């Protein structure tokens, strides 16, 4: 054998994480869709009762 | 002359396109091919 | 690995990992350093006069910065997806505009 | 007792021989003299018959392989970069716009 002309080693290969562009309505994530609708139905319900 | 062996299924030695136009070692292109040419030029022997 | 999407971490050599990341559609990347240490090398029949001058030529090419040039040419200067945005975009801690779009 | 000491102790085990942990009196490495054209350090000691082997991190190159037959490198070096640890900088004015 001659002198090593290139060094190497056992490396790890994982899937490159994408940019993960958030959705347009990403701000509606902390509250579920059921909560947002129930708020609107409770909003109109309180208004009619108040009237 | 000298007889030199190498492997093909690797990114080091590959079969360049249009191999029918070329012939012999001129058709084979790759990183390992350039290394063999530089070593043969430094030592000074045909292969 | 490309189909697992962050579930299968293949363990291969360094040179094959760098080539499959650059000279292929770069949907995967290499992370971390080498676990063990190996080394390639050209051979010569046992007891042949083509070992001394050949070994001196390999050390001469590696000293003159030739092997580093050939590696950077075949691994980076000829990649499939290339080096898009070579300057690594730092992770902005501030909130983006698309999050409240 | 260190890295090269343990390396020599392991080499002498697989290759049985009598060895003495001598230390070079010059403390230098292989350097060709300008006008004298004589080596120094471990290369100068091995070229003139002072030691039997050199268990030390000698950087292999062309100027040294022509006079001393090296072996397969047990470790690879690299010209790396060192910097201060990225500590938390002093938060200046207008820090509420973060
Ligand atoms: O064969 C060689 N092996 C060497 C090994 C080391 C280390 F192992 F890191 F101790 C160092 N150092 C790095 C920084 O300076 C202090 C000691 C110098 C080496 N040198 C001199 P160079 O060639 O000028 O680098 C050689 O010649
Ligand atoms: C009842 C209708 C509810 C529609 C909810 C749509 C939510 C979409 C979120 C991602 C948008 C990507 C453009
Ligand atoms: C998640 C789809 C419905 C979003 C409704 C948001 C209502 C906001 C005012 C209560
Ligand atoms: C972090 C210090 C920023 C200072 C900005 C001064 C701008 C003056 C117009
Ligand atoms: C699908 C939900 C639509 C809500 C429109 C706005 C109601 C106040």
Automatic annotation (TrEMBL), chain D:
<protein>
    <recommendedName>
        <fullName>Glutamate receptor</fullName>
    </recommendedName>
</protein>
<feature type="site" description="Interaction with the cone snail toxin Con-ikot-ikot">
    <location>
        <position position="32"/>
    </location>
</feature>
<feature type="binding site">
    <location>
        <position position="59"/>
    </location>
    <ligand>
        <name>L-glutamate</name>
    </ligand>
</feature>
<comment type="function">
    <text>Receptor for glutamate that functions as a ligand-gated ion channel in the central nervous system and plays an important role in excitatory synaptic transmission. L-glutamate acts as an excitatory neurotransmitter at many synapses in the central nervous system.</text>
</comment>
<feature type="domain" description="Ionotropic glutamate receptor L-glutamate and glycine-binding">
    <location>
        <begin position="1"/>
        <end position="48"/>
    </location>
</feature>
<comment type="similarity">
    <text>Belongs to the glutamate-gated ion channel (TC 1.A.10.1) family.</text>
</comment>
<feature type="binding site">
    <location>
        <position position="57"/>
    </location>
    <ligand>
        <name>L-glutamate</name>
    </ligand>
</feature>
<feature type="binding site">
    <location>
        <position position="64"/>
    </location>
    <ligand>
        <name>L-glutamate</name>
    </ligand>
</feature>
């Amino acid at each position: 054998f001659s002198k090593p002309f290139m060094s190497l080693g056992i490396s790890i290969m994982i899937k490159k994480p994408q940019k993960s562009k958030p959705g347009v309505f990403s701000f509606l994530d902390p509250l579920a869709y059921e909560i947002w609708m129930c708020i609107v139905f409770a909003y109109i319900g309180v208004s009619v009762v108040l009237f | 002359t000298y007889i030199v062996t190498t492997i093909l299924e690797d990114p080091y030695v590959m079969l360049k396109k249009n191999a029918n136009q070329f012939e012999g070692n001129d058709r084979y292109e790759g990183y390992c091919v350039e290394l063999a040419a530089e070593i043969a030029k430094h030592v000074g022997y045909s292969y | 690995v490309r189909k697992s999407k962050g579930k299968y971490a293949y363990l291969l050599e360094s040179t094959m990992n760098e080539y499959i990341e650059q000279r292929k559609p770069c949907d995967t990347m290499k992370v971390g350093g080498n676990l063990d240490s190996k080394g390639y090398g050209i051979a010569t029949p046992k007891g042949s006069a083509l070992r001394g001058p050949v070994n001196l030529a390999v050390l001469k090419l590696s000293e003159q910065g030739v092997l580093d040039k050939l590696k950077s040419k075949w691994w980076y200067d000829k990649g499939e997806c290339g080096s898009k945005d070579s300057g690594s975009k730092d992770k902005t801690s501030a909130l983006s505009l698309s999050n409240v779009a | 007792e260190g890295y090269c000491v343990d390396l020599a102790a392991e080499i002498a085990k697989h290759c049985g021989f009598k060895y003495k942990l001598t230390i070079v009196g010059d403390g230098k490495y292989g350097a060709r003299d300008a006008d004298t054209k004589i080596w120094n350090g471990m290369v100068g000691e091995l070229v003139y018959g002072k030691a039997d082997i050199a268990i030390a991190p000698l950087t292999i190159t062309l100027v040294r392989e022509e006079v001393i037959d090296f072996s397969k490198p047990f470790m690879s070096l690299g010209i790396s970069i060192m910097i201060k640890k990225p500590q938390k900088s002093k938060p200046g004015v207008f820090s509420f716009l973060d």
